[PDB]
């Protein structure tokens, strides 16, 4: 009985700390990619705004 | 003596399991990383594509509007 539960306690602690180490890695990746992609999304949103305004004008043009 | 040996045997037995867990956890992280890269890419690609297609549609609505204004 006691071997399993003595080791398993160090196994629990190791897993918790390694899961934290890896979760930070995953977050750094998640944040870096999303900042890159939100920049690309923003550049496109600004072009959509420009084109929309031009359209406002062309319809009002006649 | 043998009491020391029983202790060293228990310690090594556990050490080997901690090593195996360490390697298994890294594989689980690699898979979770793969899933996350794939989810984030696929999501932002769809968003980029959708916006690219709006730019093209707006460009064709603009040309149409200007054709009707000239006419």
Numbering used by the authors:
A (entry chain B): 601 to 662
B (entry chain A): 594 to 664
The authors write:
The Aurora B chromosomal passenger complex (CPC) is a conserved regulator of mitosis. MKLP2 actively promotes the movement of the CPC from chromatin to the central spindle at the onset of anaphase.
Sequence alignment revealed the presence of three conserved elements within this region: an acidic patch from amino acids 636–652 that our structural analyses showed forms a paired coiled-coil elements, an invariant RRSQR sequence from amino acids 675–679, and a weakly acidic element made up of amino acids 690–705. Mutation or deletion of these three elements showed that only the first acidic patch of amino acids 636–652 was essential for interaction of the CPC with MKLP2 in anaphase. The minimal binding region of MKLP2557-668 exists in two species with molecular masses of 25.4 and 63.7 kD (yellow traces), consistent with a dimeric and a higher order oligomeric species.
